[PDB]
Amino acid sequence: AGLSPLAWLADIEQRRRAEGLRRELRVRPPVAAELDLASNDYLGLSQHPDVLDGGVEALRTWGGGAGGSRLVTGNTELHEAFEHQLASFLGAESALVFSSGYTANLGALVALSGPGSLIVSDALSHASLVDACRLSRARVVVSPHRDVDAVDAALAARTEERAVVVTESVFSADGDLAPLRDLHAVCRRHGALLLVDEAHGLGVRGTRGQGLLHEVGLAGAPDIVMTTTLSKALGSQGGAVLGPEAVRAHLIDTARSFIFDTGLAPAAVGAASAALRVLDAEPQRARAVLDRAAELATIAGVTEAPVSAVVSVILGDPEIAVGAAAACLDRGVRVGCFRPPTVPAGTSRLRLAARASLTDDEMALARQVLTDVLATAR
Amino acid sequence: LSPLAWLADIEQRRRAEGLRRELRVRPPVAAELDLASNDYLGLSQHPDVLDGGVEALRTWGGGAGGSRLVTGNTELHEAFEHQLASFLGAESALVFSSGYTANLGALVALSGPGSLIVSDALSHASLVDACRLSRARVVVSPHRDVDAVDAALAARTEERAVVVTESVFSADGDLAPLRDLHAVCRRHGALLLVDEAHGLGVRGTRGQGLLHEVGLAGAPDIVMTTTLSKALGSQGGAVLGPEAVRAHLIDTARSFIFDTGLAPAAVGAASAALRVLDAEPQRARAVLDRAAELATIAGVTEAPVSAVVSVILGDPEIAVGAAAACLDRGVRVGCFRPPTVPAGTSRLRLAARASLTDDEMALARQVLTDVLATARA
């Protein structure tokens, strides 16, 4: 009877189901029956033939895994060729790929802050960045959403020499845009570093999909470090940290989620290298995902044009919000559903994620389904 | 200029002390005999493993497309999880993007505030990071000290307690006293969490891990973590245990929910490797044999219990020189110095692989005998 030490998991499940928060998995078949407006495969590249070719060619050339840490034997010519390709596309001096976006965020923020330093964090930050702040062992100040003045005051009063301001370029919570130039003006005045996660800007912002930093003209600044994922626009798996040449050499030397991980599979690096090749050659994809989002905003009754791929549809009640998500699926459309604790109380919503590859008949099914489901929920 | 100019001062201090890491670049045709990778079964470049990855890539695409809690959970993910749990003798399995996020997700989600973690002093970095993230009260126990764990559990004020250890420790390659530890957890009502990244494919008569080997597979009070990137030649992590544990991690583990979920190519690769190991249990026995063979070469007196042989040189610069003299003669070996290993214990690491041939061993015998006899004069 080793029942006691795991019996508390049952009480947590009762309480989670009591508040209607218990998350479960659905299982997706290879040929999907239902239109997907819930993934973050923004450019449709996960199943593009070129992307299939890149992963397979890497896989046959290099194997199924890196074989070990990049600090021992896992660093291939493929890894460094992609790092050059990504950095050049993004306008950065250097790039370093991690096994995932989550470990890229842990690795970058922890190694550039650390004990005795200050981190200024946005209150709506992605969980990967909140965990990083906990792991850095730095002193952490959390500012109101996109409150540049709050950032200014926190930096001006710090006794710590080194400070990192952390933010998303395109926020995963709401899809709004970070005030990158203002935030950066505050950092340089205070000698602080600016860390920017462009997981939702890459492939989406910029006229050629190069991210919000590039778009606002901050790409390559000596005091800006960028993180991104390879699993959204670039259709693959992995994380990446980008910035000055010294940052890469620092992460190799001290970032714990880089040294003591096995490092990104070749097939994922090959896949993402092809996907970046397609984006570079078909930059209209970054514009189509923004266009489809706008149509999704109009459909959903959102009056202001979306600046990012994902549309938020504030239903305002959790059971109503979940109810709408379930009715869409039954009608052939898989949509995203955020309820507390993900969003504040009373702001339960659907997320409609645009993809560059959406066709006109698929949008008419989105018009048909979302209109009917939302008009009932309304 | 200001906020990153401090990195140059860190580069000066690190390089002056000879600890500065750099990344070397590997060609598709390796130039050297490789004794530093943890591809224990040689399955990363195996034809079936390559096929399983290519087939997963063509059927499903290059990535999962999102977190498994939204649209990334494929039939392939859940088929490999069933395949793995059956092989391991566990009730359930859940695969992560890496062994590192598996360790964060399982330990943090099963401890949390108001709980107690008893951690082994030689714990892997992914385990150290988890304790920092759990916000539990963390007691670090002396290495494999069952009595200290018992006393720590006996005096605690927290109702829920997790004793965390690796089955095969990454530091030294020794084995955890799992049967003794589990009796103590049972006496005090604690959960036993075991990271089997270096036991999978290595311990057990069929490579099923140390937990399986000692007869503790499937226990209601044992949670297991492992990686898919060592023996199974791929990418990913996995947490295994009772069904309620999988359901809990899906519901609360942040490094599961808010990561994108393992690429199909990695799952297909790993499912193919698990098939070859299942069909070739001799691959597990062979890595211990090759390790023993490497131990005799190196002058190590006790037979290895894991794949990687430690060769203690007690001098940092000597260890660095020995690895360089090995590399220059065509052999890649591991090189560890403080603060990575304890002070006074700078060493080489020689990782055995099931796919090592007797001719590669003859080159290791000649080069290691020559370098080591020079380094221990």
XYZ file of C-alpha atoms in Angstrom, chain A:
378
model
C 0.000 0.000 0.000
C 2.143 2.827 -1.314
C -1.196 4.502 -1.918
C -0.829 7.532 0.355
C 1.972 9.465 -1.445
C -0.015 9.623 -4.720
C -3.545 9.728 -3.261
C -3.375 13.530 -3.087
C -3.447 13.566 -6.889
C -7.074 12.490 -6.586
C -7.970 15.469 -4.389
C -6.343 17.819 -6.893
C -8.382 16.231 -9.684
C -11.633 16.672 -7.751
C -10.847 20.337 -7.053
C -9.739 20.966 -10.660
C -12.924 19.363 -12.001
C -14.889 21.257 -9.314
C -13.715 24.584 -10.829
C -14.030 23.207 -14.358
C -10.296 23.566 -15.021
C -9.154 19.939 -15.449
C -7.277 19.811 -18.762
C -7.299 16.653 -20.899
C -5.783 15.510 -24.189
C -7.564 14.818 -27.424
C -5.742 12.579 -29.908
C -5.306 13.870 -33.479
C -5.273 11.509 -36.506
C -2.850 11.947 -39.417
C -5.611 13.028 -41.805
C -7.435 15.660 -39.763
C -11.208 15.732 -40.238
C -11.661 19.240 -38.785
C -10.362 22.673 -39.773
C -7.586 23.796 -37.420
C -7.727 27.357 -36.071
C -5.886 26.405 -32.863
C -2.237 25.496 -33.716
C 0.534 28.064 -34.063
C 1.715 26.716 -37.472
C 1.272 30.229 -38.812
C 2.829 29.824 -42.252
C 1.500 26.305 -42.922
C 5.063 25.069 -43.112
C 4.955 22.011 -40.826
C 3.766 19.877 -43.751
C 5.240 21.778 -46.688
C 7.034 19.417 -49.115
C 10.298 21.361 -48.867
C 10.110 21.110 -45.053
C 9.524 17.347 -45.323
C 12.589 17.179 -47.592
C 14.805 19.168 -45.190
C 14.080 16.991 -42.166
C 14.447 13.717 -44.096
C 17.717 14.811 -45.653
C 19.079 15.841 -42.246
C 17.780 12.607 -40.743
C 19.458 10.381 -43.343
C 22.704 12.398 -43.202
C 23.068 12.884 -39.459
C 20.751 10.405 -37.681
C 17.727 10.569 -35.404
C 19.448 12.469 -32.591
C 22.416 14.710 -31.935
C 23.942 11.849 -29.889
C 24.897 14.050 -26.934
C 25.315 17.566 -25.630
C 26.531 20.158 -28.163
C 29.509 20.623 -25.750
C 30.667 17.019 -26.288
C 29.613 15.479 -29.610
C 26.175 16.842 -30.596
C 27.317 19.943 -32.541
C 27.108 19.145 -36.248
C 27.958 21.264 -39.264
C 24.181 21.264 -39.767
C 23.557 23.020 -36.434
C 26.051 25.779 -37.167
C 24.916 26.257 -40.779
C 21.346 26.745 -39.606
C 22.479 29.093 -36.834
C 24.163 31.237 -39.514
C 21.065 31.041 -41.745
C 18.736 32.094 -38.913
C 20.944 34.933 -37.659
C 21.395 36.295 -41.191
C 17.667 36.150 -41.876
C 16.943 37.941 -38.583
C 19.742 40.494 -38.951
C 21.547 39.311 -35.819
C 25.252 38.701 -35.331
C 24.910 35.113 -34.042
C 22.455 32.363 -33.148
C 22.345 29.331 -30.858
C 19.662 26.629 -31.107
C 18.244 24.787 -28.084
C 16.057 21.684 -27.832
C 12.916 23.842 -27.451
C 11.700 27.382 -26.994
C 11.212 26.637 -23.301
C 14.879 25.752 -22.703
C 16.015 28.624 -24.937
C 14.138 31.019 -22.648
C 15.538 29.360 -19.505
C 19.045 29.298 -20.977
C 19.145 32.898 -22.202
C 17.545 34.726 -19.287
C 19.277 32.745 -16.517
C 22.766 33.136 -18.007
C 22.471 36.861 -18.720
C 20.969 37.797 -15.325
C 21.912 35.602 -12.356
C 22.290 36.422 -8.665
C 23.100 40.033 -7.846
C 21.261 41.278 -10.969
C 17.787 42.715 -11.603
C 15.098 41.360 -13.982
C 12.139 43.571 -14.954
C 9.344 41.304 -16.118
C 6.008 41.952 -17.845
C 3.018 40.767 -15.815
C 1.514 38.997 -18.836
C 4.631 36.963 -19.540
C 4.589 33.486 -21.018
C 5.112 30.703 -18.493
C 8.520 29.850 -19.972
C 9.719 33.367 -19.107
C 8.174 33.353 -15.610
C 9.962 30.062 -14.880
C 13.199 31.545 -16.191
C 12.893 34.501 -13.792
C 12.459 32.027 -10.936
C 15.508 30.041 -12.080
C 17.812 32.988 -12.701
C 18.150 33.606 -8.927
C 18.071 37.290 -9.810
C 15.880 39.868 -8.100
C 12.627 40.005 -10.081
C 10.425 43.080 -10.514
C 7.144 42.455 -12.368
C 5.758 45.587 -14.179
C 2.202 46.273 -15.393
C 1.640 45.193 -18.998
C 3.750 47.288 -21.413
C 4.224 49.980 -18.772
C 7.441 51.592 -19.965
C 7.422 54.198 -17.183
C 7.193 51.445 -14.568
C 10.211 49.872 -16.244
C 12.010 53.223 -16.141
C 11.378 53.730 -12.419
C 12.451 50.186 -11.548
C 15.745 50.584 -13.435
C 16.424 54.079 -12.049
C 16.099 52.910 -8.427
C 18.012 49.635 -8.664
C 21.238 49.138 -6.710
C 22.234 46.285 -9.048
C 24.730 47.064 -11.793
C 23.350 44.593 -14.368
C 19.669 44.597 -15.289
C 17.658 42.689 -17.897
C 14.260 43.875 -19.122
C 12.297 40.858 -20.391
C 9.321 41.018 -22.758
C 7.608 39.320 -25.666
C 7.507 41.189 -28.979
C 4.103 39.692 -29.764
C 2.505 38.618 -26.490
C 1.104 35.079 -26.305
C -1.611 36.216 -23.877
C -3.398 38.846 -25.997
C -1.543 39.155 -29.314
C -0.764 42.829 -28.682
C 2.600 44.356 -29.611
C 5.317 45.358 -27.171
C 6.591 48.994 -27.210
C 9.999 47.847 -28.337
C 11.601 51.186 -29.212
C 10.437 52.953 -26.042
C 11.493 50.023 -23.854
C 14.850 49.991 -25.589
C 15.331 53.739 -25.093
C 14.846 53.201 -21.353
C 17.324 50.301 -21.230
C 20.166 52.129 -22.958
C 19.653 55.188 -20.768
C 20.019 52.860 -17.784
C 22.587 50.494 -19.283
C 20.156 47.584 -19.066
C 19.874 44.646 -21.421
C 16.641 44.099 -23.368
C 15.566 40.450 -23.840
C 12.825 39.922 -26.458
C 10.914 36.702 -27.200
C 9.641 36.849 -30.807
C 7.995 33.412 -30.788
C 4.814 35.027 -32.156
C 6.480 37.741 -34.214
C 8.794 35.548 -36.283
C 7.144 34.756 -39.607
C 4.367 37.232 -38.700
C 5.796 40.728 -38.143
C 7.940 42.567 -40.654
C 7.184 42.845 -44.353
C 9.266 39.669 -44.918
C 8.297 37.872 -41.653
C 11.526 38.709 -39.794
C 9.901 39.729 -36.496
C 8.927 42.890 -34.660
C 12.487 43.788 -33.619
C 13.595 43.879 -37.262
C 10.430 45.714 -38.285
C 10.941 48.558 -35.796
C 14.588 48.777 -36.763
C 16.176 47.296 -33.652
C 17.644 44.143 -35.214
C 21.306 43.748 -34.351
C 21.531 46.306 -31.547
C 24.494 45.561 -29.250
C 22.213 45.524 -26.184
C 19.235 43.477 -27.435
C 19.042 39.699 -27.148
C 16.298 37.817 -28.952
C 14.718 34.421 -28.355
C 12.371 32.606 -30.681
C 10.936 29.157 -31.368
C 11.252 26.946 -34.441
C 7.879 25.344 -33.792
C 5.445 28.087 -34.823
C 6.167 29.850 -38.158
C 9.084 27.530 -38.909
C 6.978 24.390 -38.455
C 9.515 22.366 -36.480
C 10.892 22.000 -32.969
C 13.507 23.935 -31.069
C 14.501 27.244 -29.531
C 17.028 29.836 -30.536
C 18.873 32.674 -28.827
C 20.235 35.476 -31.016
C 22.401 38.503 -30.351
C 26.011 39.714 -30.316
C 28.797 37.201 -30.884
C 29.721 37.382 -27.194
C 26.265 36.159 -26.155
C 26.608 32.854 -28.043
C 30.030 32.174 -26.511
C 28.607 33.044 -23.086
C 25.662 30.638 -23.415
C 27.988 27.818 -24.492
C 30.059 28.498 -21.373
C 27.354 28.993 -18.665
C 23.728 28.345 -19.795
C 22.703 25.219 -17.871
C 19.712 24.318 -20.105
C 22.146 24.246 -23.033
C 25.207 22.403 -21.640
C 23.255 19.651 -19.822
C 20.690 18.923 -22.574
C 21.166 16.681 -25.549
C 20.576 19.368 -28.162
C 18.210 19.650 -31.089
C 17.636 16.641 -33.331
C 19.034 17.012 -36.884
C 15.606 16.362 -38.447
C 14.201 19.366 -36.560
C 17.101 21.581 -37.619
C 16.836 20.351 -41.215
C 13.073 20.893 -41.174
C 13.367 24.417 -39.825
C 16.156 25.289 -42.307
C 13.867 24.365 -45.220
C 10.967 26.273 -43.667
C 13.108 29.419 -43.376
C 14.081 28.868 -47.024
C 10.387 28.896 -48.032
C 9.641 31.979 -45.894
C 12.589 33.895 -47.397
C 11.336 33.069 -50.908
C 7.591 33.466 -50.215
C 7.409 36.488 -47.888
C 3.785 36.999 -48.925
C 3.057 34.215 -46.402
C 3.792 36.609 -43.549
C 1.244 38.953 -45.123
C -1.420 36.304 -45.754
C -1.507 35.166 -42.112
C -2.107 38.782 -41.118
C -4.858 39.032 -43.767
C -6.616 35.852 -42.660
C -6.460 37.093 -39.066
C -8.204 40.324 -40.055
C -10.978 38.313 -41.714
C -11.196 36.239 -38.526
C -11.504 39.467 -36.509
C -14.360 40.664 -38.733
C -16.036 37.257 -38.453
C -15.666 37.186 -34.672
C -16.937 40.752 -34.312
C -13.568 42.161 -33.238
C -13.600 45.723 -34.555
C -9.877 46.622 -34.442
C -7.530 44.924 -36.901
C -5.334 42.212 -35.330
C -1.632 43.010 -35.276
C -0.635 39.347 -34.884
C -1.809 35.945 -36.021
C -4.197 35.014 -33.197
C -7.610 36.654 -32.660
C -9.042 36.929 -29.146
C -12.836 36.601 -28.837
C -13.866 37.625 -25.315
C -16.884 35.476 -24.433
C -16.916 36.607 -20.797
C -18.011 33.360 -19.077
C -16.022 30.115 -18.632
C -18.797 27.589 -19.281
C -20.059 29.748 -22.142
C -16.496 29.979 -23.509
C -15.955 26.221 -23.247
C -19.437 25.694 -24.669
C -18.592 27.757 -27.749
C -15.319 25.876 -28.289
C -17.162 22.535 -28.109
C -19.864 23.618 -30.569
C -17.266 24.751 -33.107
C -15.507 21.381 -33.036
C -18.798 19.526 -33.519
C -19.246 21.808 -36.532
C -15.810 20.936 -37.908
C -13.650 23.760 -36.516
C -11.051 23.336 -33.739
C -10.533 26.631 -31.889
C -8.494 27.742 -28.881
C -10.068 28.253 -25.472
C -8.595 30.238 -22.555
C -10.398 30.434 -19.218
C -9.136 31.343 -15.748
C -6.441 30.877 -14.550
C -5.085 31.699 -18.030
C -6.955 35.024 -18.286
C -8.475 37.292 -15.605
C -11.943 36.454 -14.316
C -14.809 37.552 -16.569
C -12.676 37.642 -19.749
C -12.978 34.043 -20.957
C -12.332 33.832 -24.669
C -11.774 31.880 -27.837
C -8.519 32.126 -29.750
C -8.713 31.893 -33.552
C -5.227 31.297 -34.963
C -4.677 32.332 -38.578
C -2.459 30.324 -40.912
C -1.026 31.581 -44.189
C -2.244 28.428 -45.961
C -5.927 28.906 -45.138
C -8.000 28.620 -48.326
C -11.174 30.495 -49.235
C -13.454 27.526 -48.676
C -11.928 27.031 -45.223
C -12.642 30.672 -44.341
C -16.298 30.258 -45.399
C -16.585 27.290 -43.046
C -15.024 29.538 -40.362
C -17.564 32.267 -41.218
C -20.364 29.680 -41.200
C -19.398 27.975 -37.943
C -18.173 30.914 -35.852
C -21.147 33.129 -36.768
C -23.627 30.447 -35.678
C -21.802 29.351 -32.521
C -21.053 32.900 -31.374
C -24.528 34.239 -32.198
C -25.928 31.530 -29.915
C -23.400 32.261 -27.165
C -24.256 35.965 -27.584
